[model samples]
Target: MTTFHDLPLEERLTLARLGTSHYSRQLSLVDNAEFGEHSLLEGWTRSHLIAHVAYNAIALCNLMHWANTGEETPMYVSPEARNEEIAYGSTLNPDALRNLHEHSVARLDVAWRETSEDAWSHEVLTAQGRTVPASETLWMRSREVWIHAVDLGAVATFGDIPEVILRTLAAEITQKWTSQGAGEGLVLLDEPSSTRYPAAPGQDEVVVSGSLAGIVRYAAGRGSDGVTSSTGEVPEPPRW
Candidate 1:
């Protein structure tokens, strides 16, 4: 398997740049939008999605820092508190949102540049409670930036993801599918070399195929009402 560190320095730079670019665009749209009565599951508004992205960004930034220095950097006391702040604060203007995203990306870029090749495979405790290697951390963050970028409707659509990003996302999804009880009788169909990662096993197997972003939305149980589908004995979505 090709790890994040296995990529050349130029590739890593491109990943960071693309990630930041996508995030900046999303934040810009989210910050300017006004919230109405519309809610995304559990009373989440467009603002809430943006806030959640910010919250996760802060959280992961701390995690990355801790991995580098073994220091506990707290971003939020609790999720509820963070949500409350997002709900109550009316000053979440577009420029501020853009600035916050820029700052976060700056930090991430600096950290990635400073990280030694050896550090990429070092084991670190993730916010998700797994002890994943640093390379896995990169995958996690990339998935987050790309997925949430879609959730905010800031990008064109889920199908617009680049081949490189889709490949990384597919691997992540396949790993999660098996680990979260979707393994039996299911085989991921499209090879990594191909642009699709369809889960198409044998006759008894179930098949789940779509664009990388669509699969992510379906698996996460978000924004997947009628647009997503599965074949044969589909399993319940996992609690992320």
Candidate 2:
């Protein structure tokens, strides 16, 4: 089975590009007044979502720069500061928001394109404090753009995301729950592929089964529209 990291660099790059393209297209369709509409994420409007994504690209570029130059740049100074950045960004004029998103995405792409082969192996620290090779940034960025594109709520859905991405997301969600000592009694059955997360063989576990996309949506706390648990009601997945 192919995991996210096992994908070749070119393939990963294409995924990120496709995600960004989808996001940009959705952004173009939103009228300025619509920016105030609530998004898929609770308490965040379209403007906040757009701002967060734009700043995320800029933040990820900092990591790329650190990798390429052997400098110790951090993704953000502090959690509060990062939150403030997004909050400030959401208040910008509509055109400025567009420029911010466009310019930052271009800058990040240029940074990736110019990265030396050796630089891809350089170590860097993620905001979550995980130390990883620079190559991991592709997955990092890919996760954001694709998921947030859906969060923008223009037209994308969990089903619209590539199967590979949905699979990875499901794995990551379960992995996170396992690490946190959550999901103990829960066993997720991805019906389409006959795959399961946590893979603990046992009966009586609450088995949530559905298409991979539906499972991912439930796991992501987006709602249980297409999934069903053994109990006939889906349990709330631990917050991702």
- Say which candidate scores most in lDDT: 2
Per-model CA lDDT versus the true structure: 0.58, 0.87
Superposition error at 100 for model 2 (Å):
0.6
For candidate 1, give the lDDT of residue 150.
65
Per-residue lDDT of candidate 1, residues 1-240 (tens digit): 454546765675577567657766765654354533233445666656555666566666666666677565544566687667777532476556556656766777677768777666666766556776555545566666766666665454556555567556556666676566565555433322334443423356555555555555555566443233346444554444
In candidate 2, the residue pairs with backbone N, CA or C atoms under 3 Å apart (3 or more residues apart, or in different chains) clash, namely none
Query: In model 1, which runs have C-alpha deviations exceeding 4 angstroms?
Result: 1-6, 29-31, 35-42, 72-95, 116-121, 183-188, 191-203, 210-217, 220-240
Number of clashing residue pairs, candidate 2: 0
TM-score of each: 0.70, 0.96
1-240: candidate 2 lDDT, tens digit per residue: 677788999899889989899889888888888898898899998889999998889889989999999999999989999999989988898889999999989999999999999999899999999899988889999899888887888888888888888889889888888877787778788897899986333445898999988888888888888799889878787788
